[PDB]
Structure 1
Amino acid sequence: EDPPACGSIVPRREWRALASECRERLTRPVRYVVVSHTAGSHCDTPASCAQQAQNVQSYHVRNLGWCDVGYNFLIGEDGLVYEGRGWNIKGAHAGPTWNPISIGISFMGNYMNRVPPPRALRAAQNLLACGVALGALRSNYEVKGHRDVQPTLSPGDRLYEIIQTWSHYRA
């Protein structure tokens, strides 16, 4: 029960996450959505993507010393959206200029020479629909590539190729 019509998101308690310790709230409603890629290993089953989720967070919490996984939501090629910082805890995904104003969703994999399956792309768009529904994202929300906001290779040629197809993508 994470309020009406939210396209099946895996809760932290399910992917065996560690307790978040982030105190910063995000000023709703949010205008931007930054799509990125973990550039880490990819997964196609929920079982493997639960393990892969943990991997991203432990690296952010134990090693990098941040309060929680830097992303608001992680997407698996298993076609499921994983909950990280969520719609309210401000993310750590695109630097100081963008972190307090945009939501950050990342695709679990390295998408330079590899494309994400339709189910994952479907789940991401479906996640943004629930966003508007909850009142976290503005009906008029703008989707920006990670390259668009920071000098980075992410989300990867192939995935950056497809998010331009997305209707809400702004130049």
Structure 2
Amino acid sequence: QRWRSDGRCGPNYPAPDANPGECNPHAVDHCCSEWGWCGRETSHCTCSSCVDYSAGSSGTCPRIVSKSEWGSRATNYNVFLSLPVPKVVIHHSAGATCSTQSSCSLQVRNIQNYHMDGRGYSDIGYNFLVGNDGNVYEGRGWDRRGAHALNVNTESIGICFMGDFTSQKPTASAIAAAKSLISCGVSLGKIRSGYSLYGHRDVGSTACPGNLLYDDIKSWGRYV
């Protein structure tokens, strides 16, 4: 990857997939200092030759497409989650995949219409969605109680990958976007650092989030 395993970085310690060697954006030590160490302190982040990998397109926080950007309909749901959140539940759409911001935005619009008009929800059920386009889309957000898993709605953030992943896996960009979303939520204090990661099937009776995606999330950090 773009950072080393020994904790070094910079133009003197090249990474396997990166020269100069970089730092894990989602790690506590995400700044490459003068002395070629990945560190966390202000000195590591604010020197003239220092690089803070928390920031940028590859930072901890992924670009979240807001409700107004993906074309959400008017909602007025204000049932708030107790923050920070103990656990993260992973979902799959069990539906269409999407590869562009337009098609994924349309897909989110469809899912919202299904939840509100077909099932009678106050809004789209999930807190966030993720498309194969590598983007994150805003559902009920960080602060509002979701409707994605009955046993755990009040204690969790629901992230739903858009697609069916029983025999497929999402694009690497989708996975990266979800992980970065989680990391971001942790950095903000929306999600506890000692959070627990669940698949939907772990907390309910479904095949969600599909076999292969469920297999992949075991390798993610903090899976229960």
TM-score by length of 2: 0.72
Moved over 3 A (4+): none
Larger Rg: 2
Q: Please state if 1:156 is matched with 2:218.
A: no
Report the Cα distance in structure 2 between the residues aligned to 1:9 and 1:117, rounded to whole angstroms: 17
- Aligned residue for 1:14, secondary structure, equals helix
Match of residue 38 from structure 2:
none
Q: CA contact under 8 A between 2:91 and 2:200: conserved in structure 1? A: yes
Match of residue 113 from structure 1:
167
- Structure 2, unaligned runs of 5 or more: 1-58
Match of residue 108 from structure 2:
53
Report the Cα distance in structure 2 between the residues aligned to 1:12 and 1:6, rounded to whole angstroms: 17
Question: Matched residue pairs, number?
Answer: 166
* Percent pairwise identity: 47
- Structure 1, unaligned runs of 5 or more: none
Q: CA contact under 8 A between 2:60 and 2:181: conserved in structure 1? A: no
The CA deviation at 1:140 is 1.2
User: Where do 1:105-144 residues align within 5 Å?
Assistant: 105-144=159-198
RMSD: 1.2
Q: CA contact under 8 A between 2:60 and 2:180: conserved in structure 1? A: no
The CA deviation at 1:141 is 1.1
Report the Cα distance in structure 2 between the residues aligned to 1:20 and 1:110, rounded to whole angstroms: 27
- Aligned residue for 2:153, secondary structure, equals coil
Report the Cα distance in structure 2 between the residues aligned to 1:42 and 1:51, rounded to whole angstroms: 11
Which of residues 157, 166, 182 in structure 2 aligns to 1:103?
157
Q: Which has the higher contact order (CA 8 A, sep 6+)?
A: 1
TM-score by length of 1: 0.94
Report the Cα distance in structure 1 between the residues aligned to 2:70 and 2:191, rounded to whole angstroms: 24
Structure 2 counterpart of 1:108, one-letter code: M
